[PDB]
């Protein structure tokens, strides 16, 4: 996020980090319950990647994080990689997340939910802060 | 990328107004936000765009794409969750 600010640790409990076996953060995702994570299809996640829950500072050795293995990758068959349309992938965890104060679910809208232009929302992540 | 989790508030735009920046690349299962002095960027992909509805944070978008330079003046493009939630509910029910 360019121009963002540091979050209060544990305040976005559904935010997870997708890291490869190397320990490299490459994408974010959101827990929708303890066994499922929603992320983008363009992230190109495989079952060798890990979902890290409860993390705030990726450089800390003292945070009680949960490294969760992925059982199956569900890429929306409607995803069009040429247009980057319907960019959603569900990840079924082989090992369920343990919900706590720092790990919980985000709500999903009804297909009929209205989110008006001008509404201030929030986005979070460990992406580049400067490009 | 940063060690610690970053956050940023940003406004949603209408797809019509967003097409002024991206033209026809803006499809129906997409929602734009930003062009407000902040921008999602590489490494943020897959992450959430949440809006508070009736007191609870709900997933409105998924960081999808945008400016190759993460220009804080161009709007970012997110997967519109409202157009994909039926697929999610179907996948979770079958697995």
């Amino acid at each position: 996020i360019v121009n963002g600010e540091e979050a209060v640790p544990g305040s976005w409990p559904w935010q997870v980090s997708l890291q490869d076996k190397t320990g490299f953060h490459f994408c974010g995702g959101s827990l929708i319950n303890e066994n499922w994570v929603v992320t983008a299809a363009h992230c190109g996640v495989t079952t060798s990647d890990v979902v890290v829950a409860g993390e705030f500072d990726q450089g800390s050795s003292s945070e009680k994080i949960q490294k969760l293995k992925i059982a199956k990758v569900f890429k929306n068959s409607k995803y069009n990689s040429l247009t980057i349309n319907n960019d959603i992938t569900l990840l079924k965890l082989s090992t369920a997340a343990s919900f706590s104060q720092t790990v919980s679910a985000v709500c999903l809208p009804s297909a009929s939910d209205d989110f008006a232009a001008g509404t201030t929302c929030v986005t979070t992540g460990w992406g580049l802060t400067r490009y | 990328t940063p060690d610690r989790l970053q956050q940023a508030s940003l406004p949603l735009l209408s797809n019509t107004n967003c097409k002024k920046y991206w033209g026809t690349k803006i499809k129906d299962a997409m929602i734009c936000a930003g062009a407000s002095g902040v921008s999602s960027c590489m490494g943020d992909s897959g992450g959430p765009l949440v809006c508070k509805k009736n007191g609870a944070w709900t997933l409105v978008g998924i960081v999808s794409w945008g400016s190759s330079t993460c220009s804080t003046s161009t709007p970012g493009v997110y997967a519109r969750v409202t157009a994909l939630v039926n697929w999610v509910q179907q996948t979770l029910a079958a697995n």
């Binding site: 209060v8 976005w12 919980s104 709500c107 | -």
Partner: peptide, 10 residues
Amino acid sequence: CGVPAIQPVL
């Protein structure tokens, strides 16, 4: 869902 135990401060 959607209500963190640790309130985000924006």
